[PDB]
Nucleic acid binder design. Structure first.
Ligand SMILES: [Mg+2]
Ligand SMILES: [Zn+2]
Ligand SMILES: [Zn+2]
Ligand SMILES: [Zn+2]
Lengths: 65, 49, 63, 177, 49, 56, 133, 114, 262, 447, 112, 30, 281, 56
RNA sequence: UUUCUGUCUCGAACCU
């Protein structure tokens, strides 16, 4: 639904950086690896925790109610 | 993302499954075992399609 | 028992500060379904602060 | 794909070309060409089980018409009379089986058990679970597209509605539990 | 949901019978998924395209 | 075959199994809930009166 | 509670024996041409190469809960590079003059072949084998 | 529905002491301590210290089952050494080494401007 | 002295160091307390007065508890269980509130900044939601429409990570020792050559490499423990390691006190 | 409940969680796998009922199987692999870990075993630390492929007075074997002592494996370049041989084998040659691979996996059988649309050329699937058949029982056998033993 | 040669050697007469059936024919003196143990 | 250029065209 | 009325449960009273084995105009030991244990696994695709780019390993690991990396049940079917055989008479029929 | 087929002999054929073995 | 000072 608050494995906070990741992907047109590394995720656990998210909250949100 | 292709019957979504059958209007030759007196049947499920 | 079927808050246990609903009382020990966890727990009814139908003031066991 | 010379070079080549694929991608990005137009121009033809009897099919769209030791090998093309070719062999797999990473590397019974179990996996079944009052629904808290994704996953729309999570697996014998 | 929409049944009884229909003939290529199937009494009879 | 050779019975449970190397060979772990429901009728003697009164 | 066998051995052949931390040495005495030894050594702790002279002895001292030495100055047969502990398990005869004794030093095998000068060897768990380079 | 509760993972239970020493009729001068509501975090550390002491013959810690938050240490010492004193000195050495490490870390940080 | 420290890099949320002349058991137990026993403040009890977003109350509650909170003066905040007060007291918990009513036609994001502390801290810098991101929003919580209210009252209580991973103040505690096989503590899997196939650790250049000539060292032990503690942000890495030592010390002291009491 | 030991009385341990926990070594007689399996607990309601369940049918008493006079239950899982890596010759253990594993054995006498190596440092052999779990008075002596007492490969096994003299522990020692450690312990010391032995051996080996580690992965399946080259060479040689056999058949210079026609003769020759090629490729893969291979350790432990497993793992999946024969020509004289008709080559007729590490071409994958669901359907029908046969056998033999004249008689009383099993000896108590009068020459018997 | 049979005589003998600490150098105090009589008495005491009469002794002798062949194969005089070195008291212990384990090994009737 | 031979990578555009018109429930819908 | 023993305060005057309230066990969800010709209860209770918070309630008219009500109840369901999980390669298992990050093993870089799978899954099942998925998934997280994991792509394991090595790791996916209890480096290395896993429906909360003298069948007075109906277990023919083999005749008698259904039957000696008009009073 | 036979020295030795296996069930008439060893003839059908040789 | 509800029957899908 929403980006997870913390990395499941290490517990690093990754909910801070979802919109920064989207901005680096769209505005700056950086590849996935560069965007993640510049956001400061070194461990592949955190890196997949941001890379594999699906922004299902948008789909659920923009119904009527 | 709902593809459709189902029926809402009493509020419950129901789907009909494709049912296999031998094709109609084709001659099919089958051997038969020794205990059966019949040997070499030819079948055709003729029908107005 | 007046305490039956009332919103309660536990006070000396690991589940303290937690809402609950009193389900049955076997005498000196009230069973409450936790209004947080999907588990029933027995705890002495004297050490629970009971709340009215809506939240607000917390009344001890004096009713 | 239909295979026919169409030209003077003599070698048998498919009917679809880079121009056709470019126009297909162009209409993709715009939304003109479509599967229907592909059929009408006769670049793709439908074959059923009975018509499969009398056609020789090419596996790879380019390889069989005309080495690193770990690289993929193939039975040589001693036939110069191919008539069709697969679009891609992966499409023999069904919906549940095409979720699988590397089914060819798997054993086939495990592919079958996966094809049964993926139907029972947990995920987002639809984006309208708030309004549907289904008898029994399961919604994963944080769905996740797998790191290893099959190219058919975009048509199955699995990445949009995935069912499962990525976990750091350790193939380890740690506690005996 | 997608598999159910694209599922195929076979009228043959689920009870103990010959294994020939339960097998896949070579002609299932590209028409029936060689892997996807239920396990147990329906295996090889229920087919997914 | 369905009610005499094999039939139904109370005082029983069914659930999943997990491995456990820290359990003795002839021992088996029972969920607390399953223990709470299942019972054994034990008769009152002088030799267990104190424990049975405590259990009650 | 004293030395039962003592001799020099010239390690004739060292075989890594497929293991990384253990090797089998086949050795023959420099004195008694008919005495032979074939013994497993933890080469990691006691490196050994072919054609080395090794002073082997077997002792029966220096129930019984083992303990660390408790003291830098505890007396013990400390004049040896490598001491192992094992139990004899077999004594076979060959050529009606030579006797071969088998020891297991916690799964490290030795065969010690020689004539009846090995008579002191006894089927007792208490058997230390000490080696000096 | 009946998973074990997790505040008792380190909180003392009602009518349950932190330590239970009882002797051991199993080797001479050997005692058994059951540490309730502890994990490997101290079993490994207190046991490593007890093995660093020269006058202690046996020291080994134990977690029977991960469900129950309790470990259990056995110490066998030499004659005239109360294993309670052995455990006391192991703990005292632990606290001293930790005080040294804490002071060292604060000093090294305050040295380093960042 | 005894244990020795050498801090290699330091940062707001990271510190790498070397521990020398210390037992492997001691280094590990220090880490274990550093990952489990350090107390921290995190949101514990969420009360929803009006929720109308597209998310479960259980969902948003779990999300909110995972939010880091400033917990510098956590030692000064007394444990909830030890408190005997009535009508939860500010000496046992920190009360926050989140009121996020979307107005804009676009989706209105809800961030860590929106929580406002309502309880009386009394000069203790405890309970501020940590805002580590570059722009300064905070951690994304949930998103709203123009019509969707979200009104809730949070109670954050002291707790350790052994209750729940939310209270963990350290994310990743890198740990390594003997980068070479000087102690032979691992047999390296290989096909042709272990030296070729295995990457060299970054710490390999902070030890002398081994020599093929000299034999294996019998009596060597695990020393020179290269660590790197990262903080989620609730507690600076200063205090992450320092409070970690404090809890391990205090717990061994409590064992001693139990011994003397009995 | 396919067999007798699938219903055993256990001692309750109340344990807070939602799942039955059971000792791992009792999974074999139950045929349990913890893969979502469920099991069934029946609580007795009387003192008769409890006494019957404790004295008649309890796991320690049920260790020995009457079915094959061997232990039904043994140490068959990662504990087997751990005990093998433990009792490897070169596995030496610190004072630290020795102290902990020793104390894991609760049977343990109390004396620290002395090290096998003391002065360079106190070091205990894996076998030595294991031996504290085996009770005193256990004598075992198994000789493998001409093991000698100086066993260079550490094969075989020799245990004296509960001390493992040598021999790496495998399935054939601590698993379900007639001459096994479990068998001799149960027959000598008894059921309670043997159950304690299961507990102690598991506890020691699992502690050791916890602090040691074990894994598996890609590198455990890849073989080196020369091995892959020579594997391709053997497969190509087999293919050339099959092509030559085919050409001889096409020119019908091949005489059909006795009792077989020419078609079936050609097919038998082809399937034999493809099987031989797959076996040769597997042999080369194994002899290349080393004990640092996790998989080779797994097979040599014998906990699970096999040679055919490794061969298909890394070398060649092999010729795929459907209905006990090669892939039948489905469309018209062709196995799939991609081969022209009359194609009898191995690739066309189901021979997978390459392994699962390396991948399947799509024809190979489809033939793989056909063989796979052939196998699955075969088990799905065999379980039904075997269930019916078992039920019939039970209804036939239900009333027979050895009555107190040592006669097995049914409900009417008809003597089925005047002596139970021609001896009157309970099936569990038999063991395999030699008779020295039969063998040997007259001279040997004389001497 | 290897065939299933009721009690492991080799394990009984090895257990006797270990629990008696049998010394191979020392001469044995057994006598040939004692060995033969002890073996015969064991054979007669190995009961699975019991009547005082022909057909049941034939049934018993029949039932224990193979096991007694094993016993005379193993506990021969030349074997018991050459390859084993059991004393008199160790021999008696072995015979008693063989008898006890056989009586254990008898079917426990009422077995299904 | 437009008439050049085609790549197995670029067949996936054709597959996308298939699932763009027909989708995955084409059989039941038609 | 014939109301149930479950609580009823959860209802409000309207007849629903005042959404926001939560329920459990045998709390009533819809409050219905059927007239009888004063009235009786027909309210549907909540499932005994399931509980949670009421997410939503619907009230409407059906085709015929009779009021129709649809109440939806939400619960969080967290992994437990008995919960079953599976990869996309047939590797399925129930959780054995739940260990914390401290007791978990750990890599050099501090990455702690979310799951540990026993290597006994691999050889028997021949499941190389799980391992290749793990290697590709590690390369995918290390590069950031998604790994085309399709069935018959050109990519091979050597290429995967070469990329993984270029990213400063093993070629083969192994990686040195350290014990969580002591920090001892593991003597053998651990294959490691991200892999996709699914939570399957079969979970112990839904599959656990025990009985002791519950509702009986109306016909046979044997226990009724199923967990949902407070049902009971069965002693099949095969298990009867196993007990017959065991010799626990007392067990079988107790289990098939006293624990299942015991009926006292008076019979006449001359006829031996169930025709005795017994007036025990 | 190699059979174990006592050698004149008295040790069992492998002796290869010739054996005619068949795909037919006719015991009564085949057992008469001169030049065979009817004492040893065997047939896969226990039914014909009974009907020719007897119940035992 | 007022308590032992309660079901069948045809299937379908899935688990071991
Ligand atoms: Mg299973
Ligand atoms: Zn992470
Ligand atoms: Zn307070
Ligand atoms: Zn009558």
């Amino acid at each position: 639904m929403i980006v997870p608050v913390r990395c499941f494995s290490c517990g690093k906070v990754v909910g801070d950086k979802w919109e920064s990741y989207l901005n680096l992907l769209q505005e700056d047109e950086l590849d996935e690896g560069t965007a993640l590394s510049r956001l400061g995720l070194k461990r592949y656990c955190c890196r997949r925790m941001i890379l594999t998210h699906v922004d299902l909250i948008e789909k659920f949100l923009r119904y009527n109610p | 993302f709902d593809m459709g292709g189902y029926f809402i019957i009493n509020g419950s979504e129901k789907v009909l499954i494709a049912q296999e059958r031998s094709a109609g209007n084709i001659v099919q030759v089958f051997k038969k075992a020794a205990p059966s007196p019949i040997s070499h049947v030819a079948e055709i499920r003729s029908a107005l399609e | 028992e007046v305490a039956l079927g009332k919103t309660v808050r536990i006070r000396s246990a690991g589940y303290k500060g937690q809402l609950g609903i009193v389900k049955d009382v076997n005498g000196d020990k009230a069973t409450v379904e936790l209004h947080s966890k999907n588990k029933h727990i027995t705890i002495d009814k004297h050490k629970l602060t009971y709340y009215n139908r809506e939240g607000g003031e917390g009344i001890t066991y004096d009713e | 794909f239909i295979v026919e010379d169409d030209e003077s070079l003599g070698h048998k080549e498919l009917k679809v070309r880079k121009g056709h694929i470019a126009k297909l991608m162009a209409t993709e990005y715009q939304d003109e060409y479509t599967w229907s137009s592909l059929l009408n121009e006769g670049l793709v033809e439908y074959i059923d089980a009975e018509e499969e009897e009398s056609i020789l099919i090419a596996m790879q769209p380019e390889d069989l018409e005309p080495v690193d030791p770990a690289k993929r090998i193939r039975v040589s093309h001693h036939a110069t009379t191919f008539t069709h070719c697969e679009i891609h062999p992966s499409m023999i797999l069904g919906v549940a089986a095409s979720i699988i990473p590397f089914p060819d590397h798997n054993q086939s019974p495990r592919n079958t058990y996966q094809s049964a179990m993926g139907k029972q996996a947990m995920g987002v079944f639809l984006t309208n679970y708030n309004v549907r009052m289904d008898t029994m629904a399961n919604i994963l808290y944080y769905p996740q597209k797998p790191l290893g994704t099959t190219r058919a996953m975009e048509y199955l729309k699995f990445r949009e509605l995935p069912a499962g999570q990525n976990a750091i697996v350790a193939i380890a014998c740690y506690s005996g539990y | 949901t997608l598999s159910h929409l694209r599922r195929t049944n076979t009228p043959i009884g689920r009870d103990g019978k010959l294994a020939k229909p339960r097998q896949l003939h070579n002609t299932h290529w590209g028409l029936v998924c060689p892997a996807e199937t239920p396990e147990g009494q329906a295996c090889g009879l229920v087919k997914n395209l | 075959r369905g009610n005499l050779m094999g039939k139904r019975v109370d005082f029983s449970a069914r659930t999943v199994i997990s491995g456990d190397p820290n359990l003795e060979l002839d021992q088996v772990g029972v969920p607390k809930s399953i223990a709470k429901t299942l019972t054994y009728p034990e008769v009152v003697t002088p030799y267990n009166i104190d424990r049975l009164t405590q259990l009650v | 509670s004293n030395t039962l066998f003592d001799d020099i051995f010239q390690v004739s052949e060292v075989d890594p024996g497929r293991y990384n931390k253990v090797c089998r040495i086949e050795a023959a005495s420099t004195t008694q041409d008919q005495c032979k030894l074939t013994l497993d050594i933890n080469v990691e702790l006691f490196p050994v190469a072919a054609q080395d002279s090794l002073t082997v002895t077997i002792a029966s001292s220096l129930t019984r809960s083992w303990r660390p030495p408790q003291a830098g100055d505890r007396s013990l047969a400390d004049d040896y590079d490598y001491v192992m502990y094992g139990t004899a398990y077999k004594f076979e005869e060959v050529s009606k003059d030579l006797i071969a004794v088998y020891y297991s030093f916690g799964g490290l095998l030795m065969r010690l072949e020689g004539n009846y000068r090995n008579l002191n060897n006894l089927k007792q768990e208490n058997a230390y084998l000490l080696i000096r380079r | 529905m009946n998973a074990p509760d997790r505040f008792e993972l380190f909180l003392l239970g009602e009518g349950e002491s932190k330590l239970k020493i009882d002797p051991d009729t199993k080797a001479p001068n050997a005692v058994v301590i059951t540490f309730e509501k502890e994990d490997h975090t101290l079993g490994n550390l207190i046991r490593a210290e007890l093995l660093n002491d020269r006058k202690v013959l046996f020291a080994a810690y134990k977690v029977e089952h991960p469900f129950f938050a309790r470990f259990k240490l056995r110490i066998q010492t030499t004659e005239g050494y109360d294993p309670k004193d052995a455990l006391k000195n192991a703990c005292n050495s632990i606290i001293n080494k930790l005080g040294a490490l804490k002071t060292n870390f604060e000093t090294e940080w305050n040295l380093q401007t960042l | 002295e005894g244990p020795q420290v050498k801090i290699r890099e330091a940062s707001k949320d990271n510190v790498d160091f070397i521990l020398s002349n210390v037992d492997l058991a001691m280094a590990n137990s220090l880490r274990r307390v550093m990952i489990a026993e350090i107390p921290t403040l995190a949101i514990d009890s969420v009360e929803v007065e009006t929720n109308t977003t597209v998310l479960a109350d259980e969902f948003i509650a779990h999300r909110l508890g995972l939010i880091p909170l400033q917990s510098m003066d956590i030692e000064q905040l007394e444990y909830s269980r030890d408190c005997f007060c009535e009508d939860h007291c500010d000496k046992c918990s920190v009360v926050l509130t989140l009121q996020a009513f979307g107005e804009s036609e676009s989706t209105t994001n809800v961030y860590s900044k929106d929580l406002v502390i309502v309880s009386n801290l009394m000069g203790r810098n405890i309970g501020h939601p940590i805002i580590q991101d570059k722009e300064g929003n905070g951690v994304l919580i949930c998103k709203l429409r123009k019509g969707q209210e979200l009104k809730l009252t949070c109670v954050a209580k002291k707790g350790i990570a052994k209750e729940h991973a939310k209270w963990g103040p350290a994310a990743a505690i890198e740990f390594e020792y003997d980068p070479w096989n000087k102690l032979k503590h691992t047999d390296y899997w290989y096909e042709q050559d272990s030296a070729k196939e295995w990457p060299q650790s970054k710490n390999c250049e902070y030890e002398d490499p081994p020599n093929e000539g000299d034999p294996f060292d019998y009596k060597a032990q695990a020393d020179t423990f290269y660590m790197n503690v990262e903080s989620v942000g609730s507690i600076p890495v200063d205090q992450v390691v320092v409070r970690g030592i404090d809890t391990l010390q205090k717990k061994v002291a409590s064992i001693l006190l139990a011994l003397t009491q009995m | 409940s396919l067999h007798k030991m699938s219903m055993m009385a256990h001692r309750v341990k109340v344990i807070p969680y939602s799942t039955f926990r059971l000792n791992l070594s009792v999974t074999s007689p139950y045929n349990a796998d913890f893969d979502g399996d469920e099991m069934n607990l029946h609580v007795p309601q009387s003192e008769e009922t409890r006494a019957e369940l404790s004295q008649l049918c309890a796991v320690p008493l049920q260790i020995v199987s009457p079915q094959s006079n061997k232990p039904c239950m043994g140490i068959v899982q990662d504990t087997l692999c751990g005990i093998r890596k433990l009792t490897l010759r070169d596995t030496f253990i610190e004072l630290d870990q020795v102290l902990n594993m020793l104390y894991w054995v609760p049977d343990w006498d109390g004396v620290i075993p002395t090290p096998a190596i003391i002065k360079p440092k106190p070091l205990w052999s894996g076998k030595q630390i294991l031996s504290v779990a085996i009770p005193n008075g256990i004598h075992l002596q198994r000789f493998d492929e001409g093991t000698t007492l100086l066993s260079p490969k550490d094969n075989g096994m020799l245990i004296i007075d509960g001390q493992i003299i040598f021999g790496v522990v495998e399935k054939k020692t601590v698993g379900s074997s007639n001459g096994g450690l479990i068998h001799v312990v149960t027959r000598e010391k008894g059921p309670q002592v043997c159950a304690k032995l299961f507990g102690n051996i598991q506890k020691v080996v699992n502690f050791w494996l916890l602090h040691n580690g074990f894994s598996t992965g890609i590198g455990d399946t890849i073989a080196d370049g020369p091995t892959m080259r020579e594997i391709t060479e053997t497969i190509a040689e087999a293919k050339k041989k099959v092509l030559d056999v085919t050409k001889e058949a096409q020119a019908n210079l091949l005489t059909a084998k006795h009792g077989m026609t020419l078609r079936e003769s050609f097919e038998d020759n082809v399937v034999r040659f493809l099987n031989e090629a797959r076996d040769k490729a597997g042999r080369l893969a194994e002899v290349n691979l080393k004990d640092l291979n996790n998989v080779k350790q797994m097979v040599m432990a014998g906990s699970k996996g096999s040679f055919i497993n490794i061969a298909q793992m890394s070398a060649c999946v092999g010729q795929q059988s459907v209905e006990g024969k090669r892939i039948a020509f489905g469309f018209v004289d062709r196995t799939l649309p991609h081969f022209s008709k009359d194609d009898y080559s191995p690739e066309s007729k189901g021979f997978v050329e390459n392994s699962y590490l390396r991948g399947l071409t799509p024809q190979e994958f489809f033939f793989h699937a056909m063989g796979g669901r052939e196998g699955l359907i075969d088990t799905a029908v065999k379980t039904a058949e075997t269930g019916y046969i078992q039920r019939r056998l039970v209804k036939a033999l239900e009333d027979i029982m050895v009555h107190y004249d040592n006669t097995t008689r049914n409900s009417l009383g008809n003597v089925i056998q005047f002596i139970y099993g021609e001896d009157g000896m309970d099936a569990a108590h038999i063991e395999k033993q030699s008779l020295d009068t039969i063998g040997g020459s007259d001279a040997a018997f004389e001497k | 040669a290897n065939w299933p049979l009721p009690v492991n005589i080799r394990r009984i003998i090895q257990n006797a050697q270990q629990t008696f600490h049998i010394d191979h150098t020392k001469p044995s105090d057994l006598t040939i007469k004692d060995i033969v009589l002890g073996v015969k008495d064991l054979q007669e005491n190995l009961l699975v059936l019991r009547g005082k009469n022909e057909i049941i002794q034939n049934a018993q002798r029949d039932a224990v024919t193979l096991f007694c062949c094993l016993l005379r194969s193993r506990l021969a005089t030349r074997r018991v003196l050459q390859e084993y070195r059991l004393t008199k008291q160790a021999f008696d212990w072995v015979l008693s143990n063989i008898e006890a384990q056989f009586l254990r090994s008898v079917v426990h009737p009422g077995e299904m | 250029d437009e008439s050049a031979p085609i790549t197995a990578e670029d067949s996936w555009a054709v597959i996308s065209a298939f699932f763009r018109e027909k989708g995955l429930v084409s059989q039941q819908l038609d | 009325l014939r109301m149930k023993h479950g609580t009823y305060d959860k209802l409000d005057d309207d007849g629903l449960i005042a959404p926001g309230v939560r329920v459990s066990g045998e709390d009533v969800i819809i409050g219905k009273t059927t007239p009888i010709s004063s009235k009786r209860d027909a309210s549907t209770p909540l499932r005994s084995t399931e509980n949670g918070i009421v997410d939503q309630v619907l009230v409407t008219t059906n085709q015929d105009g009779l009021k129709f009500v649809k109440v939806r109840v939400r619960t969080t369901k967290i992994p437990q030991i008995g919960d079953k999980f599976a990869s996309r390669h047939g590797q399925k298992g129930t959780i054995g244990i739940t260990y914390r990050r401290e007791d978990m093993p750990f890599t050099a870089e501090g990455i702690v696994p979310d799951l540990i799978i026993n290597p006994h899954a691999i050889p028997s099942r021949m499941t190389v695709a799980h391992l290749i998925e793990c290697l590709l998934s590690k390369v995918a997280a290390l590069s950031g780019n998604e790994g085309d994991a399709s069935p018959f792509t050109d990519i091979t394991v050597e290429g995967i390993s070469k990329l993984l090595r270029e990213h400063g790791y093993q070629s083969r996916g192994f990686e040195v690991m350290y014990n969580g209890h002591t920090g001892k480096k593991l003597m053998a290395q651990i294959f490691f990396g991200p892999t996709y896993y699914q939570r399957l429906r079969h979970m112990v909360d839904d599959k656990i049940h025990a009985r002791a003298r519950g509702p009986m069948q109306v016909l046979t007075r044997q226990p009724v079917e199923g967990r949902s109906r407070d049902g009971g277990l069965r002693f099949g023919e095969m298990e009867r055989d196993c007990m017959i083999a065991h010799g626990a005749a007392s067990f079988l008698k107790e289990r098939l008479m006293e624990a299942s259904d015991a009926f006292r039957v008076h019979i006449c000696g001359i006829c031996g029929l169930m025709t005795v008009i017994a007036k025990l009073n | 087929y190699d059979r174990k036979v006592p050698s004149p020295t008295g040790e069992y030795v492998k002796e290869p002999e010739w054996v005619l296996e068949t795909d037919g069930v006719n015991l009564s008439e085949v057992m008469t054929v001169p030049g065979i060893d009817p004492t040893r003839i065997y047939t896969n059908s226990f039914i014909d073995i009974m009907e020719v040789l007897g119940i035992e």
